Write an enzyme that holds these catalytic residues in place. Structure first.
Site, PDB file in Angstrom:
ATOM      1  N   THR B  45       0.827  -1.206   0.000  1.00 39.06           N
ATOM      2  CA  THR B  45       0.000   0.000   0.000  1.00 39.06           C
ATOM      3  C   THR B  45       0.862   1.256   0.000  1.00 39.06           C
ATOM      4  O   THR B  45       0.629   2.191  -0.777  1.00 39.06           O
ATOM      5  CB  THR B  45      -0.920  -0.004   1.220  1.00 39.06           C
ATOM      6  OG1 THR B  45      -1.600  -1.261   1.297  1.00 39.06           O
ATOM      7  CG2 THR B  45      -1.937   1.122   1.125  1.00 39.06           C
ATOM      8  N   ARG B 140      -9.372   0.305   5.136  1.00 38.78           N
ATOM      9  CA  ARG B 140      -9.127   0.371   3.698  1.00 38.78           C
ATOM     10  C   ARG B 140      -9.923  -0.656   2.905  1.00 38.78           C
ATOM     11  O   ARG B 140     -10.378  -0.348   1.798  1.00 38.78           O
ATOM     12  CB  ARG B 140      -7.635   0.183   3.405  1.00 38.78           C
ATOM     13  CG  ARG B 140      -6.767   1.388   3.726  1.00 38.78           C
ATOM     14  CD  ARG B 140      -5.315   1.038   3.419  1.00 38.78           C
ATOM     15  NE  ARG B 140      -4.372   2.110   3.721  1.00 38.78           N
ATOM     16  CZ  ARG B 140      -4.072   3.105   2.891  1.00 38.78           C
ATOM     17  NH1 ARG B 140      -4.650   3.186   1.698  1.00 38.78           N
ATOM     18  NH2 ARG B 140      -3.186   4.022   3.257  1.00 38.78           N
ATOM     19  N   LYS B 164      -0.310  -9.097   9.730  1.00 38.23           N
ATOM     20  CA  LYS B 164      -0.041  -7.686   9.920  1.00 38.23           C
ATOM     21  C   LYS B 164      -1.377  -7.012  10.225  1.00 38.23           C
ATOM     22  O   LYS B 164      -2.327  -7.015   9.430  1.00 38.23           O
ATOM     23  CB  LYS B 164       0.611  -7.013   8.695  1.00 38.23           C
ATOM     24  CG  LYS B 164       0.721  -5.504   8.743  1.00 38.23           C
ATOM     25  CD  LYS B 164       1.162  -4.994   7.379  1.00 38.23           C
ATOM     26  CE  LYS B 164       1.139  -3.461   7.272  1.00 38.23           C
ATOM     27  NZ  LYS B 164       1.199  -2.983   5.911  1.00 38.23           N
TER      28      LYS B 164
END
Ligand SMILES: [Mg+2]
Ligand SMILES: [Mg+2]
Lengths: 296, 296
Positions: B45, B140, B164
């Protein structure tokens, strides 16, 4: 401005043995046309745009364009992306294949700023000469096109004529039409089709119309004819099915319903989409019983 | 299980006249290596994966792999998609181009169910023989990999070794490691690097480390040694920059900071990302002044 409004269907994409069922797709579109629908939206979110190839996007758009020929029904092609270069190409692509306009979803995942959203949609609108409908769905994209940004794009770019709102925010729908009454506000949330239309919205892009096109079409046309009493009665009657069709992420419930109604051959998705739970499958079947589902 | 842990950097992707600045990219990775970073994440990202072409993806992964040869630094390549077929292809792609492992973000926009997420990551993990780190960032993606789903994937698939987390949810971080202490919890939120590590997290995938690799690396290794007073001290000192680096959507502030530090030549993004506001630009400039920024 050239516009595409009225009762519109976010078309599901049926699969058969892991491939686009092209005969089913055409049959489903003809079923929409024959039940009063004003436009169809190929390869949007309900059509599993994310898991189709480019070739398949093309195929579904061409089938929509071909099936709509000789009728008044327009093709509002899904063509959007979180990469502006790709969004521009998809818009030109859709126009090239006979789409009457494009539905362009706000960039998902990379969360552009309002300035970036403005430049994104300006590039898209400048790339074609057909109507462009913005699509705001923050629960999916992680970003929101603000009212100011939508209004600026509508006023600054000729092809941009309104927005499909899927935001559960009737305040914003008042905000939009109170400050820019010339834009076309399009309901992207079936349960609140009537409140959006009764505030001056000019259409719906519907999930429920896949299963009940006659009811969504009648609701929209009643409202556009300012027969709000009749439009509300259909909206109220549709609430149960409108809600159960999102018991799981759209389009999982609508495809389940289309399969249960015998309108598509197999209950097939492309991963990461999948069949519903046993429980939600049963809930969808239960809710459908009170509704009359047109055949072919 | 094979794991990739420690202090890790989500690499920015510098552009120069609209193309990837390959020289700059290799130079930035050499700077990370020389400041104690244990792994780099190309084309995530922070690296603007969404607006890179396939070829640019190949290129960035190859530069990362080549720059990390002869060093102990691993390449955890960004390789995720909201289409399972494509995510599998990207995983195989990354492995065949020398990546040590993959970071694979939860499907964005189409909101798969927990069952769909399981089948999604199971297919990805079965397609390669290198470690796979899940990436949960619901702000997101619009979806959440639940603790139960993460734990099932960890237990059922050899390559999936942890997650993560970018979810602002230390309760979930407790839930994860209390029920499955063998997994590698990786901080994806710089401001709370220390709380995650002090609860048994085993690494960070950091935005701030692009600018301050030595400080993030020291923080992580102090924490891994249970020198919590020293790790907390750096985390506390880093709070101001950790926060200002998200005044606008990442990677807009970090690219701004890298440009202000003279570490990249051009403040260039690909639409829909764009330069920050004038004001946000100035705020980033002020906060950087407290920090001692390593050169090349
Ligand atoms: Mg190595
Ligand atoms: Mg030590």
């Amino acid at each position: 401005k050239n516009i595409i409004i009225g009762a519109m269907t976010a078309l599901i994409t049926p699969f058969k043995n892991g491939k686009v069922d092209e005969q089913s797709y055409a049959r489903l579109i003809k079923r929409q046309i024959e039940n009063g629908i004003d436009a169809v939206v190929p390869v949007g979110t309900t059509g599993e745009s994310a898991t189709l190839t480019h070739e398949e996007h093309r195929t579904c758009i061409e089938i929509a364009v071909e099936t709509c020929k000789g009728t008044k029904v327009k093709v509002l092609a899904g063509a959007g992306s979180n990469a502006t270069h790709q969004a521009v190409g998809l818009a030109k692509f859709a126009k090239e294949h006979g789409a009457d306009g494009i539905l362009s979803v706000a960039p998902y995942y990379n969360k552009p700023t309002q300035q970036g959203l403005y430049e994104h949609y300006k590039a898209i609108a400048q790339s074609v000469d057909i109507p462009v409908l913005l699509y705001n769905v923050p629960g999916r994209t992680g970003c929101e096109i603000s009212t100011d940004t939508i209004i600026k794009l509508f006023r600054d770019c000729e092809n941009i004529y309104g927005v499909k709102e899927a935001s559960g925010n009737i305040d914003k729908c008042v905000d939009l039409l109170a400050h820019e009454p010339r834009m076309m506000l399009i309901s992207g949330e079936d349960a609140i089709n009537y409140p959006i239309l009764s505030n001056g919205g000019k259409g719906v892009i519907s999930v429920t119309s896949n299963l009940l096109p006659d009811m969504i079409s009648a609701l929209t046309h009643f409202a556009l004819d300012e027969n709000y009493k009749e439009a509300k009665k259909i909206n109220d009657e549709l609430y149960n099915i409108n809600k159960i069709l999102f018991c799981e992420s759209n389009p999982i419930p609508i495809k389940t319903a289309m399969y249960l109604a015998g309108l598509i051959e197999s209950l097939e998705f492309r991963l990461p989409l999948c069949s519903p739970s046993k429980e939600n499958f049963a809930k969808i079947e239960e809710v459908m019983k009170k509704y009359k589902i047109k055949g072919f």
